[PDB]
């Protein structure tokens, strides 16, 4: 008898590849990674199994060249909390603001990892908010502020190379994320049809397909 494998903290607490940031030689010299628990293109399905969830999460950063080659560069990883401004450009005050935490690592150093607490004003995340956010906007043309609850925004990640003078080495930063202390709530039935958009559960009505495989008749094998 062993039922730990069927626990949530055993069902999510695995570091997945979430963010892939390109820092070439010859895009603009910085990057901003809006945190989205997707990217790891299956956790999406694994998450909408529930409606209300809550978790703390640890991020880990593996950085290298496209070669995999290791170079002595000194990076700056910066967490930009919700509401706080994102870096407008390479030398905006957003790197120095210090409210937004920063991580300074070399690549000769082992992968930098950091923990991030649960950051919603609400008691839990929602994967479904059937209705419109506080408060209701009128004036027509609009039909875009739906099923989107900005209370679930976890903030953003930004990287440098660093400035001021440009790097010499093309770099890629592999971003890994793992959940902890998970607590979900009211359970949803799992998706059956292909996704189309993020932050919206539309589907292809022209091409509806059965949930599972099918046979020719019931009486045959």
């Amino acid at each position: 008898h062993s039922t730990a494998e069927t626990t949530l903290d055993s069902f999510f607490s695995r570091a997945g590849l979430v963010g892939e940031i390109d820092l070439p030689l010859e895009p603009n010299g910085y990057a901003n990674w809006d945190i989205d628990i997707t990217g790891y293109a299956q956790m999406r399905r694994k998450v909408e199994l529930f409606t209300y969830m809550r978790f703390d999460a640890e991020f880990t950063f593996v950085a290298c060249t496209p070669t995999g080659e290791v170079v002595p560069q000194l990076l700056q990883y910066m967490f930009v909390p919700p509401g706080a401004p994102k870096p407008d450009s390479r030398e905006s005050l957003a790197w120095q603001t210090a409210t937004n935490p920063s991580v300074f690592v070399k690549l000769s150093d082992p992968p930098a990892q950091v923990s991030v607490p649960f950051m919603s004003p609400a008691s839990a995340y929602q994967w479904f908010y059937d209705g419109y956010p506080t408060f209701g906007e009128h004036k027509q043309e609009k039909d875009l502020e739906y099923g989107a609850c900005p209370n679930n925004m976890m903030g953003t990640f930004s990287v440098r190379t660093v400035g001021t003078s440009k790097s010499k080495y093309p770099l890629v930063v592999r971003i890994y994320m793992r959940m902890k202390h998970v607590r979900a709530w009211i359970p949803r039935p799992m998706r059956n049809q292909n996704y189309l958009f993020k932050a919206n559960p539309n589907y292809a009505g022209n091409s509806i397909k059965p949930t599972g495989a099918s046979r020719t008749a019931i009486t045959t094998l």
């Binding site: 409606t51 929602q126 908010y129 059937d130 506080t134 209701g136 039909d143 998706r191 009505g205």
Partner: protein
């Protein structure tokens, strides 16, 4: 099993308790006594009896969305526009009446946070979002288009994981569900955050031989429980 005489406030239903009686989430609706981080009893707790939607042989289903269903209808509907904060539970009681010579099971089930989605198409467009008249249908409700995916890529095959009650005219012709307050916040605007959406989906289609009234109604009767409001706005 014969007789039925139930009355509250002003409204009056006539049901019974001879088969399956009550399904709750496992938790009766209640109040709250914290720092938040009016309780009407002599008007709200009355059976709002909705409009009986018909059911043809070739129907696909219907679904209402709480609390939109009543927000523009009833004394309750009134003190929802004027107040801004909302919290309640519900005593949904779905009752269909038909002969013994009919057949066709129904699935009364409540799906909390029913975010819907329509088909992309029409003209060659790729992206679109559902109008207000499909997310907040009101008392009349809304005939869904694609049952199998609940207009949300959500298989009905697994819907029973959520609170549900079967209506099989062979055995039972009545349904009663009790729904508690379900939210990430202890209070929300009743107007722009419709919580759970009730839906009635037919699996075994209604059938009959020749000449037998092909249309049996579905009387949906519901009543709020442990309703709660706070601050209020001005009147017209």
């Amino acid at each position: 099993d014969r007789v039925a005489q139930l009355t509250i406030g002003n409204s009056t239903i006539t049901t019974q308790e001879a088969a399956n009686i009550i399904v709750g989430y496992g938790e009766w609706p209640s109040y709250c006594s914290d720092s938040d981080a009016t309780r009407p009893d002599v008007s709200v707790n009355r059976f709002y009896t909705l409009d009986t939607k018909l059911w043809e042989k070739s129907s696909k289903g219907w679904y209402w969305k709480f609390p939109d269903v009543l927000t523009e209808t009833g004394v309750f509907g009134q003190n929802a526009q004027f107040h801004y904060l909302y919290r309640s539970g519900f005593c949904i009681h779905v009752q269909c009446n038909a002969s013994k010579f009919h057949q066709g099971a129904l699935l009364v089930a409540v799906l909390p946070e029913y975010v819907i989605g329509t088909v992309a198409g029409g003209t060659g467009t790729e992206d679109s979002h559902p109008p207000y008249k499909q997310t907040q249908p009101g008392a009349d409700g809304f005939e869904l288009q694609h049952p199998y995916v609940l207009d949300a890529g959500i298989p009905i095959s697994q819907l029973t994981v959520c609170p549900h009650q079967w209506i099989n005219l062979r055995t039972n012709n009545c349904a009663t569900i009790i729904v508690p307050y379900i939210n990430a916040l202890p209070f929300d605007s009743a107007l722009n955050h419709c919580n759970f959406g009730l839906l009635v989906v037919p699996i075994s289609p209604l059938d009959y031989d020749q000449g037998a009234t092909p249309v049996i109604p579905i009387t949906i009767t519901l009543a709020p429980m442990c309703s709660e409001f706070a601050g209020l706005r001005q009147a017209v």
